[PDB]
A paper describes a structure:
Bacterial multiheme cytochromes (MHCs) attract much attention for their contributions to extracellular electron transfer whereby electrons are exchanged across the cell boundary and consequently between internal enzymes and external redox partners. These processes evolved to allow the capture of electrons for anabolic reactions and the release of electrons from internal oxidation during anaerobic respiration. Thus, we investigated whether amber suppression in MR-1 could produce ncAA-containing MHCs and, specifically, variants of the MtrC protein, which contains ten c-type hemes. MtrC is found on the outer surface of MR-1 cells. MR-1 cells typically present MtrC tightly bound to the external face of the outer membrane spanning the MtrAB porin-cytochrome complex.
The structure of wtMtrC was inspected to identify surface residues that might be changed to ncAAs with limited effect on the MtrC structure. Residue A293 in Domain II and E344 and A430 in Domain III were chosen, Figure 2C. Thus, site-specific replacement of MtrC surface residues with BocK has no discernible impact on the protein structure. By contrast, there was no detectable FMN reduction for ΔmtrC/omcA MR-1 cells cultured in the absence of wtMtrC. Cells from cultures augmented by MtrC344BocK and MtrC430BocK also displayed FMN reduction rates comparable to those of MR-1, Figure 5C. Thus, our results indicate that MtrC344BocK and MtrC430BocK retain the structure and redox activity of wtMtrC. A crystal structure of the homologous MtrCAB complex purified from Shewanella baltica OS18542 shows that MtrC Domain III, which contains residues 344 and 430, makes no contribution to the binding with MtrAB. This is consistent with the ability of wtMtrC, MtrC344BocK, and MtrC430BocK to restore FMN reduction activity to ΔmtrC/omcA MR-1 cells by associating with MtrAB in the outer membrane.
Author numbering: 44 to 670
């Protein structure tokens, strides 16, 4: 017995007896009543002191009225709370909006049915009718873009409204700690200008992900009538969470301000909203000014691929590349072979910077039709490794020089790409070609896609922008299939051009794409992801292992490559053999057909000999499932 989702509604609030009597209705994912909840609670009862009541320009705030774990299970899905000690500070005011924060802890019903955590708030007027005014600024869904939904965020609770209901202005005042008011704390813990906590944690990682982008949490919504408060209510308490060097009382770094009465007179909402979003808006506008459309063909006699790139404008209209060439900062073409199991490796891939800082490489030209044309020079080895190897696949990344939201000429031929404020990575593309002339093979893209990456990195993620690459922006330009609803899938299959079964530049980095995203995020994003495979995966494509060969998993002492059979390679990125994270010894893994950090020849010969999926039946919901 398992409940997938526990829904909670406050269906009745009655003050006929003084202390409100509060009824909660609980249903499962099929809208059936849930009877026997043992850990239901009113975590907080609050009422809303309105905007400006504590002083001109001051925020609305939640005043505390108590809590209750005293309830009767009415045996029909409803539960009725009473308060043994309502409003112990005697501040109740029926003219104020009243809020109740209700939580149900994860656990089991008596019959043993598992029940997940549930949290909610609901607002009322002082007689239990609908409220007359609210403080609805954000909703819990924004946090779930980056923090695993249903798991605690730092501590105490899983939904932001529960945090807000405890981390109130009253709470902070009572502790003498302004910074623990939630509207200060929330920005503090994602911004690196000052540390937080007794251990003085500098939020370097949070800063690098959030980048002070107000729109990842402050989102327009008809559901949230105070959503524009992030620009409409400037206060020293909130604005100082990132602006940590101003002393408004002493007038250092800013004119003296003794209260919040005049902030809005100067910091008008238009300005605050615009200035904090200007650069991401400008960059997004530049990215969407141009596109590219790429084709590739194989010469059947020379077996080389010729890649042709058509620049287009925002409407899809052709743009002769000669007209914008002086502003093209880089354009790179990387070609590998065998999209389901790349065959050329990292050293054997074809790659060129066809353009650098306005200059065409001698190996690339612009034809009379205005297209860039380049022909591969490395041995593509087409058709030498089975049918999949009939297909070459080419990844095109490019960037354009830019300053303050405008494209500009690349005036410096030697510009090294380190200063990312001087250029914009643009929409990348992917082109297939076959030696036979038959339709190309393509890699599966049905298990991970860019929408998941964009939840944390935004859709404008300029992947690898810097000294080494132009920056790959991933979009429907390189989509070649749709999901069951007809939405174009933006895959990461182009990344395999470099993230090959042989690894990347070193054999020691688990560079194969099947390994690399796991390695980076289990090492550096575990606080956000943990074992939550759904953070990237809609499914696992276990059938894809039948198209895989050996995967590079280590470097030998002499720096040559060591390889594993592909399921073992994929699981061991997070489950290192010989570590506390892997119960199977090397010997046992070999008894299941695996090769573990052996030669490419041995791992290749044994690549379809692994018996792991006889026992293991992983799903995204539970990847640990075994028979
Ligand atoms: C992606 C753009 C995020 C959004 C949206 C939210 N959070 Fe966040 N948060 C993010 C990162 C990358 C980090 C650093 C993690 C690390 O391991 O260093 C954080 C950190 C926090 C913290 C600090 C404590 C911690 O768990 O590390 C808190 C308290 C926190 N985040 C809360 C939080 C809330 C309530 C959000 C919705 C309003 C929210 N975050 C959104 C990334 C992102
Ligand atoms: C009361 C029922 C709480 C709930 C709900 C939430 N938090 Fe909390 N938090 C609470 C206390 C008593 C404290 C210690 C405050 C102090 O005096 O130092 C905290 C502290 C934090 C912090 C540390 C802030 C800092 O040191 O600057 C963070 C980052 C934090 N809490 C986050 C947080 C989140 C994200 C919550 C909702 C998921 C949340 N808290 C709820 C009490 C309560
Ligand atoms: C998620 C990690 C956030 C980011 C990024 C930014 N804000 Fe935020 N803000 C967030 C929360 C959860 C809250 C509390 C809402 C509540 O109901 O209490 C806030 C609050 C503010 C406020 C206070 C508004 C008020 O009525 O007093 C302001 C002025 C504000 N936030 C501004 C702001 C700006 C300018 C940001 C980008 C630079 C920004 N926030 C980012 C969550 C997050
Ligand atoms: C962290 C999430 C922030 C919060 C909260 C607030 N601001 Fe901010 N501010 C932040 C950044 C990253 C920047 C630089 C933006 C850029 O692209 O250059 C700013 C900048 C300003 C400025 C202009 C700079 C100056 O020297 O004056 C102003 C006037 C400003 N911010 C005001 C402001 C107000 C009024 C805030 C509370 C509503 C506020 N900031 C919060 C980051 C963050
Ligand atoms: C008019 C007399 C103002 C009053 C009243 C308030 N602010 Fe201000 N502020 C004002 C200016 C002209 C600037 C510089 C703008 C620029 O782009 O250079 C600022 C700056 C700030 C900042 C940013 C600080 C920084 O990043 O260096 C913040 C966060 C800020 N101001 C907040 C703020 C608050 C909270 C106010 C009321 C207490 C307030 N300002 C009043 C002009 C004026
Ligand atoms: C939130 C749960 C994330 C998901 C979903 C994705 N990524 Fe991620 N990524 C995340 C964090 C916290 C970090 C560490 C950042 C730091 O400052 O240490 C990363 C790191 C990367 C990087 C490194 C480059 C960088 O800009 O930091 C890359 C190239 C990267 N992530 C790619 C990526 C891909 C392709 C994703 C979809 C499969 C993806 N990320 C999802 C957080 C999260
Ligand atoms: C060759 C031109 C590459 C392309 C195309 C892609 N990546 Fe890459 N990546 C490349 C190298 C040489 C390295 C360093 C060595 C290593 O294997 O770690 C990387 C690294 C990463 C990482 C690790 C974190 C980091 O260094 O940024 C990640 C998460 C990563 N690469 C992801 C990634 C994605 C999602 C790609 C397609 C959009 C992609 N890379 C393409 C070289 C090349
Ligand atoms: C984003 C940071 C990821 C998280 C979190 C997890 N996985 Fe993943 N996985 C990711 C990528 C980019 C790929 C490569 C896709 C490709 O084209 O090669 C994979 C691949 C797998 C596979 C192979 C089968 C497939 O669907 O392609 C497996 C079996 C797999 N991943 C398992 C897995 C598990 C069990 C995770 C939770 C512990 C998990 N992944 C998280 C990206 C990310
Ligand atoms: C990182 C992206 C992982 C990948 C790839 C795989 N697993 Fe995993 N696994 C991961 C975590 C973070 C955890 C939880 C560890 C904890 O104690 O919290 C697990 C756990 C398991 C388990 C259960 C633990 C045990 O001792 O058996 C199993 C059975 C398991 N994982 C299997 C498994 C398989 C078969 C994988 C390849 C298909 C695989 N995991 C990949 C993280 C990651
Ligand atoms: C049945 C005889 C199995 C075979 C065949 C394979 N595995 Fe297994 N595995 C099995 C069990 C009973 C467990 C423990 C489950 C638990 O919840 O305790 C595991 C565990 C793993 C793990 C997690 C290890 C850990 O977290 O310490 C991994 C990563 C794993 N197994 C991988 C794996 C591989 C790669 C296999 C084929 C070579 C394989 N298993 C086969 C049972 C069985
Ligand atoms: Ca209701
Ligand atoms: Ca909820
Ligand atoms: Ca901080
Ligand atoms: Ca295309
Ligand atoms: Ca077999």
């Amino acid at each position: 017995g398992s409940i997938q989702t526990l829904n909670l509604d406050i269906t009745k609030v009655s003050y006929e007896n003084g202390a409100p009597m509060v009824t909660v209705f609980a249903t499962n994912e099929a809208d059936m009543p849930v009877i026997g909840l043992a850990n239901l609670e009113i975590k907080k009862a609050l009422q809303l002191i309105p905007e400006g009541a504590t002083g001109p320009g001051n925020s609305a705030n939640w005043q505390g009225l108590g809590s209750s774990k005293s309830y009767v299970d009415n045996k029909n899905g409803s539960y009725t709370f009473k308060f043994d000690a309502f409003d112990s500070n005697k501040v109740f005011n029926a003219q104020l909006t009243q809020r109740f924060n209700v939580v149900s802890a994860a656990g089991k019903l008596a019959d043993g049915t598992t029940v997940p955590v549930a949290e909610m708030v609901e607002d009322f007027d002082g007689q239990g009718n609908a409220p007359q005014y609210t403080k609805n600024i954000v909703s819990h869904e924004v946090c779930a873009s980056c923090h695993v939904e249903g798991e605690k965020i730092y501590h105490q609770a899983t939904e932001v409204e529960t945090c807000i209901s405890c981390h109130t202005q009253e709470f902070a005042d009572g502790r003498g700690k302004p910074h623990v008011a939630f509207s200060h704390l929330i920005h503090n813990v994602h911004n690196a200008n000052k540390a937080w906590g007794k251990d003085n944690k500098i939020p370097t990682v949070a800063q690098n992900i959030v980048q002070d982008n107000c729109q990842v949490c402050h989102v327009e919504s008809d559901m949230l009538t105070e959503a524009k408060n992030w620009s409409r209510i400037p206060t020293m308490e909130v604005c100082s969470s990132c602006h940590v060097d101003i002393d408004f009382a002493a007038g250092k770094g800013h004119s003296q301000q003794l209260d919040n009465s005049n902030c809005i007179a100067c910091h008008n909402s238009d300005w605050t909203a615009e200035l904090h979003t200007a650069k991401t808006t400008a960059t997004k506008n530049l990215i969407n000014q141009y596109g590219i459309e790429t084709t590739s063909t194989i010469n059947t006699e020379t077996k080389a691929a010729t890649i042709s790139v058509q620049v287009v404008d925002a409407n899809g209209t052709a743009v002769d590349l000669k007209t914008i060439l002086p502003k093209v900062q880089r354009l790179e073409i990387i070609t590998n072979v065998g999209p389901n199991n790349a065959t050329l490796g990292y050293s054997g891939k074809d790659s060129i910077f066809a353009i650098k800082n306005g200059a065409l490489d001698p190996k690339a030209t612009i034809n009379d039709a205005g297209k860039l044309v380049y022909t591969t020079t490395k041995d593509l080895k087409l058709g030498q490794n089975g049918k999949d190897s009939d297909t070459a696949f080419s990844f095109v990344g490019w960037s354009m020089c830019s300053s303050e939201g405008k494209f500009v000429d690349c005036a410096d031929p030697a510009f090294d790409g380190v200063d990312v404020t001087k250029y914009t990575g643009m929409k990348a593309d992917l082109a297939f070609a076959t030696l036979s002339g038959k339709a190309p093979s393509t890699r599966h893209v049905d298990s991970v896609n860019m929408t998941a990456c964009a939840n944390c990195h935004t859709a404008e993620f300029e992947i690898h922008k810097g000294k080494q690459h132009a920056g790959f922006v991933m979009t429907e330009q390189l989509s070649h299939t749709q999901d069951a609803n007809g939405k174009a899938i933006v895959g990461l299959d182009a990344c395999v051009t470099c993230h090959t079964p042989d690894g990347t530049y070193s054999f020691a980095n688990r560079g194969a794409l099947e390994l690399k995203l796991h390695k980076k995020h289990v090492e550096d994003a575990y606080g956000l992801i943990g074992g939550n495979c759904a953070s990237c995966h809609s499914d696992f494509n276990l059938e894809s292992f039948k198209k895989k060969g050996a995967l590079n998993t280590a470097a030998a002492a002499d720096k040559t490559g060591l390889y594993s059979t592909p399921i073992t390679a994929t699981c061991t990125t997070c489950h290192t053999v010989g570590s506390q994270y892997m119960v199977h010894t090397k010997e046992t893994l070999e008894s299941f057909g695996a090769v573990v950090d052996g030669t490419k020849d041995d791992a290749t010969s044994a690549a379809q000999s692994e018996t792991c999926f006889y026992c293991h039946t992983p799903t995204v919901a539970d990847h640990t499932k075994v028979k």
